[PDB]
């Protein structure tokens, strides 16, 4: 990005792979930080009245 069309065409002509499309300089889809806080679910225990440690 931040380039004109002439050198863009020179890039896509020196390697005909459409380098403008994906270029490994991310601008947009950096993951937006300060995410919401998670609430972690608990799996096959905290199930009351049946979690017998003699069993498992």
């Amino acid at each position: 990005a931040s380039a004109t069309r002439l050198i863009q065409g020179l890039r896509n002509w020196a390697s005909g792979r459409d380098l403008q499309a994906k270029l490994q300089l991310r601008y947009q889809e950096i993951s937006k930080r300060t995410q919401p806080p998670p609430k972690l679910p608990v799996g096959p225990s905290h199930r009351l009245s049946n979690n017998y440690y003699c069993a498992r």
Binding site: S45, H46, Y52, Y53, C54
Partner: protein, 230 residues
């Protein structure tokens, strides 16, 4: 010739008549876990940890103070034996405070070891957790009676070896303070021995109190001095 057969897990062994189930299990090698039994004092039955499912009976019976009838079969690794141990261990850890960082028996607890090797993995009892105000027993022994599990072992040791009779149970329900009523400085001989009687971190050493933790030290043979007995 005065020997009774018990089938500990099917393995037969001869036991002198009248002795306990627990000494038969310690004869074959088993350790039924225990909190109010000790091999120097009288055998009270207040901790309920020593239970065992003896066959052909719907009721689990104790093994701290059980006399041995002829020809037993003892199951120490059955289903409801483990269920009873997990239940009793879950009962003990309710009214016991979170002090395992600051408690003076981090490496040498008993609730910790037996709660790992027999207890549950999840807890319950969201509310509650009563607290007993401590005393000032002596400048030799630091005392926090909140960690006291009311196991009645300092009492039996005092009344049957020290002969001093300055310890007692007081109250009912959850509210059973083990201690001394009259705010008297309990001073006698062998009062230093009471900090190894107490299986939980409730009666610790006063000058030692916060100077180490028993996995860092290394243990070394030595002989008593200034006493003629050694």
């Amino acid at each position: 010739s005065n020997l009774i057969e018990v089938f500990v897990d099917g393995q037969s062994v001869m036991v002198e008549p009248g002795t306990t189930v627990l000494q038969a299990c310690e004869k074959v090698g088993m350790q039924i876990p225990r909190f109010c039994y000790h091999e120097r004092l009288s055998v009270a039955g207040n901790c309920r940890m020593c239970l065992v499912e003896i066959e052909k009976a719907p009721k689990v019976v104790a093994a701290c103070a059980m006399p041995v009838m002829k020809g037993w079969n003892i199951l120490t690794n059955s289903e409801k034996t483990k269920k009873a141990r997990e239940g009793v261990m879950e009962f003990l850890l309710a009214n016991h405070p979170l002090d395992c960082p600051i408690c003076d028996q981090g490496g040498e607890c008993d609730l910790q070891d037996q709660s790992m090797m027999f207890g549950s993995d999840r807890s319950r009892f969201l509310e509650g957790k009563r607290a007993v105000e401590d005393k000032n027993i002596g400048p030799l022994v630091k005392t926090i009676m909140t960690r006291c599990i009311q196991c009645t072992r300092c009492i039996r040791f005092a009344s049957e070896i020290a002969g001093v009779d300055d310890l007692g149970t007081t109250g009912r329900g959850n509210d059973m303070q083990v201690g001394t009523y009259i705010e008297k400085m309990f001073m006698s001989e062998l009062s230093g021995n009471i900090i190894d009687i107490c299986p939980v971190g409730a009666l610790t050493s006063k000058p030692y109190a916060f100077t180490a933790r028993p996995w860092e030290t290394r243990k070394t043979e030595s002989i008593d001095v200034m006493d003629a007995v050694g």
